Structure formats: structure tokens, C-alpha cells
Amino acid sequence: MKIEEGKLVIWINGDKGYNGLAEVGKKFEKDTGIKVTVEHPDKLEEKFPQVAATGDGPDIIFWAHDRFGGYAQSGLLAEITPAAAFQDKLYPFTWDAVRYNGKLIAYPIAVEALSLIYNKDLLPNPPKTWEEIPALDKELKAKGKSALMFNLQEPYFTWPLIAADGGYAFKYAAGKYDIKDVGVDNAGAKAGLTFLVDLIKNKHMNADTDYSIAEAAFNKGETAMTINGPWAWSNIDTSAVNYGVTVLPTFKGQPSKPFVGVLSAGINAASPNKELAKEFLENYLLTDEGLEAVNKDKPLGAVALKSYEEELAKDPRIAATMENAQKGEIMPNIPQMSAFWYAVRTAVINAASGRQTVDAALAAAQTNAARAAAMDKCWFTLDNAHYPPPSLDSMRSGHPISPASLGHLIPSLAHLDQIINAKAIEPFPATMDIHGPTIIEDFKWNVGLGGAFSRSVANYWEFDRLERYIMQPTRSYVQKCIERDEVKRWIAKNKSMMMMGRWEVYMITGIIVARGGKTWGTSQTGDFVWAVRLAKITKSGLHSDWKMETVFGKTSSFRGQKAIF
Numbered sequence: 001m002k003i004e005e006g007k008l009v010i011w012i013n014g015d016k017g018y019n020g021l022a023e024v025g026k027k028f029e030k031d032t033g034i035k036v037t038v039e040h041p042d043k044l045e046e047k048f049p050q051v052a053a054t055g056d057g058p059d060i061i062f063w064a065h066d067r068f069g070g071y072a073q074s075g076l077l078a079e080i081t082p083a084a085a086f087q088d089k090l091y092p093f094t095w096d097a098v099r100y101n102g103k104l105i106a107y108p109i110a111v112e113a114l115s116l117i118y119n120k121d122l123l124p125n126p127p128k129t130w131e132e133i134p135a136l137d138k139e140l141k142a143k144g145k146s147a148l149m150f151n152l153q154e155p156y157f158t159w160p161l162i163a164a165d166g167g168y169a170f171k172y173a174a175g176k177y178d179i180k181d182v183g184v185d186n187a188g189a190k191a192g193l194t195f196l197v198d199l200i201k202n203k204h205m206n207a208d209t210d211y212s213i214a215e216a217a218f219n220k221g222e223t224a225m226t227i228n229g230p231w232a233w234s235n236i237d238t239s240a241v242n243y244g245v246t247v248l249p250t251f252k253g254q255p256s257k258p259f260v261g262v263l264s265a266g267i268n269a270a271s272p273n274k275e276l277a278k279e280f281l282e283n284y285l286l287t288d289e290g291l292e293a294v295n296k297d298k299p300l301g302a303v304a305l306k307s308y309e310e311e312l313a314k315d316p317r318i319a320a321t322m323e324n325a326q327k328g329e330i331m332p333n334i335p336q337m338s339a340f341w342y343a344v345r346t347a348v349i350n351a352a353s354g355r356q357t358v359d360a361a362l363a364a365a366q367t368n369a370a371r372a373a374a375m376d377k378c379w380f381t382l383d384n385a386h387y388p389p390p391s392l393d394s395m396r397s398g399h400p401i402s403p404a405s406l407g408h409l410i411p412s413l414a415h416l417d418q419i420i421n422a423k424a425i426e427p428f429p430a431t432m433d434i435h436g437p438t439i440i441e442d443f444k445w446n447v448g449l450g451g452a453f454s455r456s457v458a459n460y461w462e463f464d465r466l467e468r469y470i471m472q473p474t475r476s477y478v479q480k481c482i483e484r485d486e487v488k489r490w491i492a493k494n495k496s497m498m499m500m501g502r503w504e505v506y507m508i509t510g511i512i513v514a515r516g517g518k519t520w521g522t523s524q525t526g527d528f529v530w531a532v533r534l535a536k537i538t539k540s541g542l543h544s545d546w547k548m549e550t551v552f553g554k555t556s557s558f559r560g561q562k563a564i565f
């Protein structure tokens with residue numbers, strides 16, 4: 001489904017209640033006429049940043065909150081603006097889970113955590129410790145069953161055992177997550193992963209077990225236990241298994257520490273239906289009846305809406321979910337969490353199969369997570385210049401004064417003195433929002449932009465803040481830009497035959513303003529555009545429609561500047 005004004009496209013993982021969500025979308029369509037298309041594509045948490053950059057993703061994306069901070073860093077999420085009356089309807093804990101740089105960047109839906117699900121008929125008294133599971137599996141293999149089966153392919157399900165005796169992702173200190181203090185290869189994490197590998201080495205579990213294998217085995221009554229969240233309860237209801245939901249087993253006397261996720265709905269920063277999305281999420285989904293329809297499809301856990309949460313609070317399965325959640329930790333939403341998960345996923349798979357030892361798997365995972373890096377760089381400093389920032393009022397004016405303002409078309413970064421569309425910027429359509437000012441760095445005079453800024457600005461200490469203004473050009477907006485007389489005449493100045501039917505232009509699609517308040521004076525202490533983001537618009541020939549992409553890494557020219565961040 002293609003995103004378009006007048007419709008809503010929603011992405012939600014295939015294990016959630018997407019049919020119940022679609023029913024809420026049908027009611028929204030009945031009242032308003034706005035069609036709501038719900039989809040559950042594979043690997044949506046990885047597809048979203050790619051398709052959202054191209055402006056061809058969903059209007060609303062559902063996922064656990066850990067991914068949304070990385071989306072917010074890239075500016076892919078619209079800041080949600082709920083009234084105080086609506087914020088009072090949701091628990092403050094859930095609002096805190098969807099906060100990035102102080103701003104709310106998603107609507108919290110429900111708190112979810114892993115629990116131990118056991119067959120009350122096969123196992124009337126579940127084991128309280130991980131250590132007693134081998135002996136239990138031996139007795140259950142004698143009766144034609146197995147003790148425990150759960151998804152060994154995703155680190156989300158193995159992590160509670162890994163973190164039980166001291167494993168952790170990123171240490172929280174000084175009010176921040178220290179991305180250089182990873183606890184993936186410490187003694188606690190080694191003991192946890194070793195116990196898991198020993199369970200496989202002793203044939204108590206198979207390292208190839210995934211989500212489908214474990215769900216089918218438990219719902220058929222072939223294994224006495226599994227580990228899963230509330231979304232899986234309804235499938236067990238359909239089966240003939242009298243099941244229970246209780247605490248995860250302890251390890252070395254310590255409780256298993258599941259990573260607590262908060263299912264959240266973010267709004268695409270490039271969506272042209274932000275008001276429709278806000279209306280659907282606030283007035284239809286985040287209601288007793290919208291959440292009821294979703295929860296009846298696939299249970300959500302402890303929902304964020306206080307009214308429906310109080311209604312479901314008597315459910316003992318929710319109480320077990322809350323107990324495991326209290327014994328665990330909330331997931332960080334820092335952008336490095338994606339690298340953390342990939343590293344731990346590789347480590348568990350390589351240790352469970354025997355490809356690597358536990359020490360070698362976790363050591364490589366520690367390095368890859370702390371070396372998250374790979375932050376594809378698209379920001380170029382404006383060297384040998386001090387361009388004052390454009391006022392937010394003038395950015396939509398069609399003729400901003402500063403050369404470094406959004407919408408300006410330049411031959412190259414080295415030719416910011418040659419604005420092609422100077423004072424003739426094609427009007428931004430009402431769908432193209434300018435996202436900003438976004439505080440990306442609070443200066444208080446390694447990690448952060450302080451090093452790049454201090455190395456680039458002689459009077460760096462005289463500025464306290466960096467503010468980002470981002471826009472995303474649409475195909476139709478660029479088509480109107482390249483059809484204006486200023487661009488047509490600039491293209492027509494070509495004299496070469498090798499460039500006939502060929503062109504390239506750069507559009508300023510992002511600015512980062514330094515806010516304050518060799519010998520330099522008062523002019524250098526004033527605000528200025530420190531960095532810019534560019535989109536390269538190119539037509540390669542007659543039979544090729546023009547393409548556009550954000551300039552990453554470096555620019556292609558003589559003295560091609562390198563992207564600092």
C-alpha cells in the first residue's frame with residue numbers, strides 16, 4: 001500500500017493483534033471515511049528507516065519503544081502533541097518510555113514482559129529455578145514430553161537468563177546510558193549463556209528452536225513450559241492446554257531479568273496525515289473499546305490507558321507479567337540498541353550451535369555493541385563562513401535571507417554563494433513540515449558532538465546548544481522546483497556534450513544552528529548555521545527519471561568535504 005493523503009497505513013508486528021487493530025481502523029473509516037490499512041511486513045523495524053527516508057513508509061508504526069529513539073535520532077518520527085487532558089489518561093511510566101531528548105515521539109500502548117508459561121496438567125508445580133530444569137526434562141522425556149522450549153533465535157528470549165547474574169546492555173550513570181560500558185561479556189552474562197549452552201549440549205533443548213517451533217510444541221502439549229509475552233496467550237486459549245503464567249525461574253538465586261518493552265505507535269515524520277493519525281490513536285485506539293478489540297485479538301499486557309488497565313488488573317496473567325517486569329529492566333531507547341541486539345543475537349546463535357565458545361561469542365558481541373558506530377554521516381560543516389540562522393518564520397516565506405536555509409538549491413556545497421533559487425523557493429506544500437527546533441546537544445563546558453564542534457569552531461565555549469531543522473522533500477515538490485525558470489536556465493547553461501541530458505543539483509534539506517547568547521568579535525558570538533544536510537538530485541540521461549538521495553559520507557567534487565557526523 002502506498003502512503004497518500006486521505007488514508008492511513010499502519011505497520012505492526014505479525015505477532016500482535018493486527019486484526020483487532022484493523023477493526024478499530026474500520027470503525028475509524030465508518031465515522032470519517034478515511035481508509036485504514038494495517039500491514040505486518042517481515043522485519044518492519046529494519047525496513048522502516050529505509051522506506052521512511054525515501055518517504056514511502058507507513059503513516060503509523062507499532063513497535064517496542066527501544067527502536068524509536070534511533071528513529072528519532074534520524075528525525076523519522078513526528079513529535080506527538082497530546083493535550084494535558086489526554087496525557088493524564090495514560091500512566092506516566094509509559095509516557096517516559098517514549099521520550100527522546102525530552103520530547104514525546106510516540107504514543108505508548110502497553111507494557112509487555114516475558115513470563116514463564118507452563119502446562120498445569122503436565123506440570124502442576126512449575127520449577128522456581130533454572131538449575132532444576134535438567135532433572136525435570138529427564139522425567140518429562142520419560143513421559144514423552146520435554147521441560148522447556150522457547151525462541152532461541154531472538155536474544156529477547158535468552159536475555160532474561162543472561163542478565164540474571166549480572167549481564168547488562170548499557171550502564172546508566174550520570175543521568176545517561178554510557179555506550180562505552182557494555183555488560184555483555186562479564187561473569188554474570190558468561191554464566192547465563194553457559195547454562196543455556198549446557199542445556200543444549202545435554203539435549204534438553206535444540207539450538208534450532210525458533211518462535212514457531214516453540215509455540216507449536218507448547219500449544220500441542222509436547223513441552224511442559226515455554227517463555228513468551230501476553231500476545232501469545234490467545235493462541236494457547238484456542239488450544240486444549242490448561243496453562244498458567246508465572247515468574248521466570250531464578251538463576252544462581254537471582255531473578256531472571258527480562259527486558260521490559262513498551263509497545264508504542266510512532267507517527268512518520270514524512271506522513272501527510274499526521275492529524276488523522278493523531279485522531280485515530282487518541283480518540284479510537286487509546287480508548288477502552290479500541291484496546292479491547294486489539295486485546296481480544298492478541299493480549300497486550302498492562303495497557304497504558306488507566307481505565308482499561310484498571311479493568312484488566314484482576315487478571316493473574318497480567319499480574320505475572322507485572323511481576324516479571326518489576327524484576328527486569330526497562331529497555332533503553334538509545335540509538336545503539338539496534339547494534340546491541342544484533343551483537344547479542346549473533347553471540348547466542350554462535351554459542352548455542354557450537355560454532356564459538358561462550359567466551360569468544362560474548363567477547364565479539366561486547367566489541368560490536370560498544371563499537372556501535374556506523375552512524376552514516378550526512379552533516380557537513382560550513383567552513384570559512386558564519387551564516388546567521390534563518391528565522392523560523394522566514395523558512396516558509398519563499399525568500400529567506402540566509403544562504404543556508406532549507407529549500408535552497410546550489411550547484412555544490414562549495415558553491416553556497418550561488419543559490420540557484422534565491423528568493424524563488426518553490427512553496428512548501430502543507431504536507432511538507434519543517435521539523436525543528438530540535439535540541440540535539442546541550443553544551444556544558446568521545447561521545448557527542450562537542451568534539452566536532454570544538455574542533456570546528458574557534459569560540460566553541462561561547463555557544464550552549466545545537467538546534468536542528470529538518471525537512472523531507474517529496475517527489476512532487478522537487479518536480480515543481482526543477483521546472484521553475486531559475487533551475488531550467490541554470491541547467492541550460494551546460495556547454496558539454498557528455499553532460500547533455502544530464503544534471504545534478506543539491507538541496508539544503510537540513511540545518512544545524514549553534515545557539516549561544518585568532519581574534520573574533522560579537523559577530524562570531526552570534527547564532528549561525530554550523531552544519532547542513534544535502535539531498536543530491538540527479539538525472540543520468542534522457543530515458544532515466546531523476547533521482548534524489550541524501551548525501552552521505554562525503555561530497556563528490558574537488559575539495560569534496562567529508563561528513564563530520
Ligand SMILES: OC[C@H]1O[C@H](O[C@H]2[C@H](O)[C@@H](O)[C@@H](O)O[C@@H]2CO)[C@H](O)[C@@H](O)[C@@H]1O
Nearest residue numbers: 013015064066067154155156157261341
Ligand atoms: O530479539 C531482539 C529484539 O527484542 C525485542 O523485540 C521483541 C519485541 O519487543 C516483542 O514485542 C516480541 O515481538 O518479540 C521481539 C523479539 O523477537 C526488541 O524490541 C527488538 O528491538 C529486538 O530486535
